[PDB]
Design a protein around this ligand. Sequence first.
Ligand SMILES: O[C@@H]1[C@@H](O)[C@H](O)OC[C@H]1O
Ligand SMILES: O[C@@H]1[C@@H](O)[C@H](O)OC[C@H]1O
Ligand SMILES: O[C@@H]1[C@@H](O)[C@H](O)OC[C@H]1O
Ligand SMILES: O[C@@H]1[C@@H](O)[C@H](O)OC[C@H]1O
Ligand SMILES: O[C@@H]1[C@@H](O)[C@H](O)OC[C@H]1O
Ligand SMILES: O[C@@H]1[C@@H](O)[C@H](O)OC[C@H]1O
Lengths: 436, 436
Amino acid sequence: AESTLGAAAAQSGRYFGTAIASGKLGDSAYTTIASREFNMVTAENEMKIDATEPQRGQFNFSAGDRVYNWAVQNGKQVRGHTLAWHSQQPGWMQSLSGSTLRQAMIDHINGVMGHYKGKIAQWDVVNEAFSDDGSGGRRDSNLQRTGNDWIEVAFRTARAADPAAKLCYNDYNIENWTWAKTQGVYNMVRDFKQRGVPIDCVGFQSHFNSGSPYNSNFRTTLQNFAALGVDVAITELDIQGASSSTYAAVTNDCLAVSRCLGITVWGVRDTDSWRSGDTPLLFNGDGSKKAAYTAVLNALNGGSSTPPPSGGGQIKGVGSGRCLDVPNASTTDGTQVQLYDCHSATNQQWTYTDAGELRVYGDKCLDAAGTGNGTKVQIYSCWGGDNQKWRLNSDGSIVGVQSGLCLDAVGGGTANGTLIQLYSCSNGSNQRWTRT
Amino acid sequence: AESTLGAAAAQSGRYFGTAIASGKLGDSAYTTIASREFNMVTAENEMKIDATEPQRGQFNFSAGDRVYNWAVQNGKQVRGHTLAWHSQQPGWMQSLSGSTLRQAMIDHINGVMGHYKGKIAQWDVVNEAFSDDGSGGRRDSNLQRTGNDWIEVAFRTARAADPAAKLCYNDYNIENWTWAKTQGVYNMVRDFKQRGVPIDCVGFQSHFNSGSPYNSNFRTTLQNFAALGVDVAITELDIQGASSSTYAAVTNDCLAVSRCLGITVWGVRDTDSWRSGDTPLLFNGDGSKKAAYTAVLNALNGGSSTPPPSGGGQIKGVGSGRCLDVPNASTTDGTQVQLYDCHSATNQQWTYTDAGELRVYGDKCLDAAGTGNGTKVQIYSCWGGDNQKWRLNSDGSIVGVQSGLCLDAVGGGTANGTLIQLYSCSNGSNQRWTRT
Ligand SMILES: O[C@@H]1[C@@H](O)[C@H](O)OC[C@H]1O
Ligand SMILES: O[C@@H]1[C@@H](O)[C@H](O)OC[C@H]1O
Ligand SMILES: O[C@@H]1[C@@H](O)[C@H](O)OC[C@H]1O
Ligand SMILES: O[C@@H]1[C@@H](O)[C@H](O)OC[C@H]1O
Ligand SMILES: O[C@@H]1[C@@H](O)[C@H](O)OC[C@H]1O
Ligand SMILES: O[C@@H]1[C@@H](O)[C@H](O)OC[C@H]1O
């Protein structure tokens, strides 16, 4: 299909998944969205070391299976996460070092993979093994201290435990090619392939923020790794601010690399995010689609053959030919917008921001004074409210994030002065627009 | 004094207050801000009818006195809120009608005012007695059904009860001079003054949002009421989104009217707000000052000497004489800003938005990648994080809302290429800027 992320991704032979939290499965709003939009599931925490082996030699899959069972019942494949990692290790493992730890690591891999044998698409065998100090070397952890060959051992162990699973090395801050960490991981994967160490994929967490911003060279990074003869996957995608452009850019990078298996965003709603403060996901707390959601979907569907305007630009309604206009170039908050003959003027220059706003005059925002039909569409000081965020559908309609309603020309009017309101989307020509 | 809102307001014989919730007086973070910034207090709930007369004839002033005492002890006057109101009436009063209710209203007024006789600066004697249907008439309530003269009776009773208190009529949606409701209240007060009804002030709640946006004619409203021979007061100010320009506009509206006694914002921090989702106050939940705070303080202190930049402008470092410049006009997220000979170029044109952002290229924001000294100041997609919010202090320093740190030209460098970082504010020339 082309209406849901999963189905859209499938159109390029890829999947689109999310991270599922078992404690949220009782939330109808949560499951409704999760089941509908994704065809791949990763347990956010239920398959980690502490959750699967709370005591040494004592495995527990109750939490993991709650996620797993839900995924299969809803037709989703599953990414196992994660088998060997310095973080979230149960206390009994944090106390280990040397050979004792090495064998515990091997035992854990066997126990967890054995339970899920033949049921997992991808396994993040080893997670975050490289340093984040900026050097490019191995992270100093109890695991790394058992010997530099611990990662290799983890992978060989995993291959034997379940030959049907794709074995991935997963890490963050390895998306920017210029970063030393990225290159350190490349060198390790290269070495592995050259010596025959079992490894089928590299997972790029993709936790983008102003500290580790997404960069266009992410595509070369993916290509570079793909060339090593391994698949690549965006595993824990979230973008601080959820820029619609960045989300589409990341999506297109993956679609540009044939080895990119798919994209998993780390969570369903911003409120479910481990970093909700950065509102980095595709759905907001209300369960409504954010501006970025539409951008990702449109990208998955191939995008549009109409390059979106770069800075400023009028918004012409197909049904009237006239442009979205602010009555007499007013700058008064609460001024309802109207349809007026297009012409070079600031009160007709609208900039669609990455946050989903339709700005005018530079700091005034298309604002909805309500969520129901007939709601007055006006201009108001930009503050980021969902009643100020809009989704630009490929069918030309402009939907309000908070209301889920379309920009509608009152009474279908097409003459100058016709006011703009919100109203259930109808596909009508008085609700379709074009950028110029 | 001029480093706190209260002190800055006192310079013109005015006050800057807030609404105090007695339960929060036990929280240090709350009281630290409240006791420091305001010189006027309104009990958010402690002095309402239900809270003061749970049962007819049985008055309970415990909660009210606790707020009152805290106020006076910390150098703040008090606004009594509120004596006659259709809403939030005790269960017993709600069931009353006709003359029985009329007597109840009168008795309540005498009881509460008698208790606080001579200690209340202003009393919201009657509250929200007008309708929002557009008729400009009285809202139909049990109080109004007692007789249209109930408001007048309320005020006459109040005057006799305590001659030292200024008697105000308080309401919302009476800020926009063109609204029917506003005219309704205007005519009533005009009639009252002409007939000698004892009323000394009109309180404008000033709850501004998309539904009831702030309009510059608010000053006209205040002036008009002022011309009636009554004082005016902004009693419950909060602005959806806390627009800096709107907060500054309301402030200047009061400063422009000699009869405007002062401004009270409805809450301390956004998390204390009855409308927290609209983050409509001057302080963030973590207690940090928002861009709007600095806008209000600068306005109260008499503003700058030269009219502030009307969007789009250079930011020049005092010590260097050079401008904030994005290297090579790059638009790549993560690019660190620098100092450079000032010239006409978009990569040197910054726009300070109402949200407190410093935008460039229209949709890129001055961004801090961290909160500690040495943090890199760069450009990043605009999304609204506090790490993208800035306060333009009167001394020329620019402080990050999240970090509390100042924009700093690294090492006090003055040459082209000098990088910009965050650093503890020092009043150094490499931390002072002018927008011209
Ligand atoms: O919930 C968090 C999870 O999302 C993150 O991946 O790892 C740490 C957990 O606390
Ligand atoms: O905003 C409109 C303006 O653009 C047009 O030129 O004249 C009519 C106004 O309402
Ligand atoms: O313009 C609106 C039209 O698009 C809708 O179909 O019916 C209501 C009208 O006001
Ligand atoms: O009278 C008011 C009207 O002027 C305004 O436009 O909408 C609200 C009404 O109450
Ligand atoms: O950004 C700078 C640009 O404004 C100047 O013109 O040339 C040098 C660049 O670094
Ligand atoms: O720029 C900084 C300067 O302002 C401070 O005084 O010393 C450290 C420098 O990095």
